[PDB]
Symmetry: D2
């Protein structure tokens, strides 16, 4: 299942609990960027996925403020959990920084992260 | 200035509380506002934004399952709140559907929503 | 319909020709209108769109090198032309910069541009 | 290093010439290897990249019409070429379909493709 400790291809650590009500909660620790130690995450998942072989849709958000640092930014991951002997969560993400209006056209980075239960 | 009701460009509504802890919690629904159109949302925002004129970074997730309906998908919105008399939340979003691996390349839609406090 | 001079919401100027073969060719520049701000574009469009009221799919690329400046980056716009009283091109775009592998996670910006044949 | 035949992670074949003028020209075969599956591509690349370990920025478009078929859609790939013994083109893509205005919110898929010089 989704609940567990996951790592992406960059070595970031995603510690998540999937609640019976569809909630995702936990912490995220980035291996990259303006980031130190753990950040709160919250999100949602489909708690009754299709039974036709499809993955389980989910998403979560981290605002990159904690007691140590504040990057004035937030990332959302949108993806699906795919069961198997090598369980994986495949995502794409949007990282939006707070900007002035003049800089808003460059406010948002996009990428893709794949998570498994092992580090790189 | 984030707490309250916001409206997008297409007759959808959300309703959010921005907690002191950086949490976003509320509901996402239709203009119609019927039970079957309402879904839980959760996310995060920067509770200590820059004071240089920059927007406030935020994001949230809705999984498209409620007690009535299940689309087996989730949307994440990543964006920034821009304050004023003409307050706005400018977002980009990712909507991932659960798929089989053969169909994964087509799992994710992208788009953009702008929210205002004024019911349109 | 596609052939012409288009302007995005930020005042960039897109001078395009839609060839009978599906080709898009032209230049992309900034409002100030200097030679040093002007770059080659190439792309493709659906030369035989549906007849059911749908828009016409298209895309183009600008690499941000000209005889004066090189940003070691490229933008692609993907979207559709919507004909009628006031014709419009609605796009989303990806801007990739050359990075080292360690920085590749932050190589790509995403946004959305709308074009009309009038200035904003 | 860009000119040649490339293969993505899903069996498509990207046949490209990188011109001295920054042009990308070629064919994309969504298949192995029939005429009905071949489409024109055009795009642009940084013809004077850095030699500091950074990738070479680039992008291209396919409109999914040929003499046999027409999906009324176009993909743009935005990314970077990374040279060396294990050369890659790492991309993110946007696939826009022509839609009605009512369906425009769901016009654009996003994903990622990695291309190699050896068949996967
Ligand atoms: C906003 N400034 S920053 O330097 O770019 C920044 C700050 C904090 C964290 C991230 C970060 C981690 C992280 C990850 O693990 N996968 C994808 C995206 C990504 O972004 C990026
Ligand atoms: C009444 N709910 S619904 O029709 O079943 C449904 C199902 C899946 C998705 C969306 C939906 C809305 C919505 C939006 O307002 N911005 C971005 C994405 C997005 O997706 C709505
Ligand atoms: C790293 N290259 S760059 O400095 O970011 C650069 C240089 C010149 C022009 C643009 C540019 C214009 C432009 C636009 O009109 N719509 C979307 C994206 C976009 O990018 C970007
Ligand atoms: C709406 N058009 S379509 O039916 O979905 C269609 C038809 C033929 C080929 C593709 C296609 C291949 C392909 C690829 O290799 N990477 C990225 C996107 C992408 O799209 C898409």
């Amino acid at each position: 299942g989704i609940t567990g400790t996951w790592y992406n291809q960059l070595g970031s650590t995603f510690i998540v609990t999937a609640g019976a009500d569809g909630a995702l909660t936990g912490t995220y620790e980035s291996a990259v960027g303006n980031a130190e130690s753990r950040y709160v995450l919250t999100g949602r998942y489909d708690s009754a996925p299709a039974t036709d072989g499809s993955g389980t849709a989910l998403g979560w958000t981290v605002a990159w403020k904690n007691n140590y640092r504040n990057a004035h930014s937030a990332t959302t991951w949108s993806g699906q959990y795919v069961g198997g002997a090598e369980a994986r969560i495949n995502t794409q993400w949007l990282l939006t920084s707070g900007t002035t209006e003049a800089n808003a056209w460059k406010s948002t980075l996009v990428g893709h992260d794949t998570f498994t239960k092992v580090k790189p």
